[PDB]
Amino acid sequence: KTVTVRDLVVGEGAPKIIVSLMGKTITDVKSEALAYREADFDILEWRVDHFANVTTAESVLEAAGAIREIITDKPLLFTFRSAKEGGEQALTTGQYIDLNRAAVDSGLVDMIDLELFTGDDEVKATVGYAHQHNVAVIMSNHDFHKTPAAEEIVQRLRKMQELGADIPKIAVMPQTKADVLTLLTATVEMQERYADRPIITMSMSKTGVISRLAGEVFGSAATFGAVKKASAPGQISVADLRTVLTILHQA
Amino acid sequence: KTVTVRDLVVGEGAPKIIVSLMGKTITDVKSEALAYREADFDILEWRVDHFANVTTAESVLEAAGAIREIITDKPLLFTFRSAKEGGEQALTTGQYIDLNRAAVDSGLVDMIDLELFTGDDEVKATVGYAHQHNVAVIMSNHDFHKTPAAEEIVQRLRKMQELGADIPKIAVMPQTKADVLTLLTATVEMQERYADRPIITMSMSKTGVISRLAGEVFGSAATFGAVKKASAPGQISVADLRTVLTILHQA
Ligand SMILES: O=C(O)[C@]1(O)C[C@@H](O)[C@@H](O)[C@H](O)C1
Ligand SMILES: O=C(O)[C@]1(O)C[C@@H](O)[C@@H](O)[C@H](O)C1
Ligand code: NI
Ligand code: NI
Ligand code: NI
Ligand code: NI
Ligand code: NI
Numbered sequence A, B: 001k002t003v004t005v006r007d008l009v010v011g012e013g014a015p016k017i018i019v020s021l022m023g024k025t026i027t028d029v030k031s032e033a034l035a036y037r038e039a040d041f042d043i044l045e046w047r048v049d050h051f052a053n054v055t056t057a058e059s060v061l062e063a064a065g066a067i068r069e070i071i072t073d074k075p076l077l078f079t080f081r082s083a084k085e086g087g088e089q090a091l092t093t094g095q096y097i098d099l100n101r102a103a104v105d106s107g108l109v110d111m112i113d114l115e116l117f118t119g120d121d122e123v124k125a126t127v128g129y130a131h132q133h134n135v136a137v138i139m140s141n142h143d144f145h146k147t148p149a150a151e152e153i154v155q156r157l158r159k160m161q162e163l164g165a166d167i168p169k170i171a172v173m174p175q176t177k178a179d180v181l182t183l184l185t186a187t188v189e190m191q192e193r194y195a196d197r198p199i200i201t202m203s204m205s206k207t208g209v210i211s212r213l214a215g216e217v218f219g220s221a222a223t224f225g226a227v228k229k230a231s232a233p234g235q236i237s238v239a240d241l242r243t244v245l246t247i248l249h250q251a
């Protein structure tokens, strides 16, 4: 039903706020962590794919340690988003799995993101590896250009559950207003008929913004907001996001 | 596809906020108007079915006059919601039509609400009469038991346009979460396929609250908020409503 990471219970109450941190170097990461330190969010996602030379595990881990030193009371989600799913760089399957297992081993991260389309064998063994070390797994899938049919969105979320994800996650891009409703339809069907754990769903862009606010009623356990003044289309600031989620929760 | 009521342009920018004033006597009506001066909304709906002496035209017009003396800078919408459609009192078709014609004649109201299923002939004649006096017509339909199929909702909104409504309006009750999406789908399809003027849609109760907040993206031009108490299930406090509409508008 719920997933507890530290003191945070995902799948209960108002949806949780995730913010993404991007830095190319340890200095960039430190600067961002310091700017994020006082902001009101629940989970810090480190977008590792923006970091240079990720194949040097030690550099990555030094940066993870730096984040933990600065942001000490928020769960840390380690996410290498591959270029094929909108990320900044690509790694071989072996390198990607090695990177994630190194994060797990470090004891510095509370959760890792694993992409559904990495491959069943590798994904499932790494979920097992993360669990042995008390690290939670968000399994993810993204389509930055379009919205698949509701039935296919549900299928992907169900597959993530079958592969052992603690929290299935899907983000899709609407081309029309109807696509936003398609994503919400999939969220409702999944949460009502198949889900046995928290799920995260979102429809990107300004058009899909309602998907970031309607999680409590339709079934999304978390959403993403921005800390920076200058954000992107559909990225509500964390203070405003907290304001709206609280209004809906207390209504 | 816009309607101008005083300086307010409905169908443009963020959705407009309507609040309902409910008072039994002229004394209650004046007291509520005073309180409502301290709320932030765009259109004042007077729910005439809450008024006790509705069959005495002179009392009704005195009450309307009192509202106008207190709330001078907001368009006034005259609405007798029939018991049949979720209101507080029932009237014969003739009494209902004459009440609205009396409101039109007074020169005190900017808009009247006419229920779609009152009867085609009566509705068409009353719309013509309103227009002769430069009074706008919100044509309405309510289902407090269920959410008809999306196509039926669309056909009712289309019919309202055919009968000459300035702003078609429909409120339905969800029995499930998917029903909320059905209402939003009908809003989009009406907007895409047939709307040549603003429309107002809402899924009632707490379950449908998101429908009252997402009008800018899906096509609803106005939304109802509560000042002290709700005039229908699902309305949230007017200050919180404006806050959410603004955050979404800037997203
Ligand atoms: O990383 C994702 O899954 C995001 O959905 C990508 C993009 O949509 C951002 O605007 C979101 O804040 C987060
Ligand atoms: O907000 C609603 O659901 C309403 O039912 C909408 C409209 O019918 C108004 O006349 C009511 O006072 C409230
Ligand atoms: Ni609470
Ligand atoms: Ni170990
Ligand atoms: Ni396990
Ligand atoms: Ni593509
Ligand atoms: Ni604006």
Ligand code: NI
Binding pocket: B105, B133
């Ligand atoms: Ni006249």
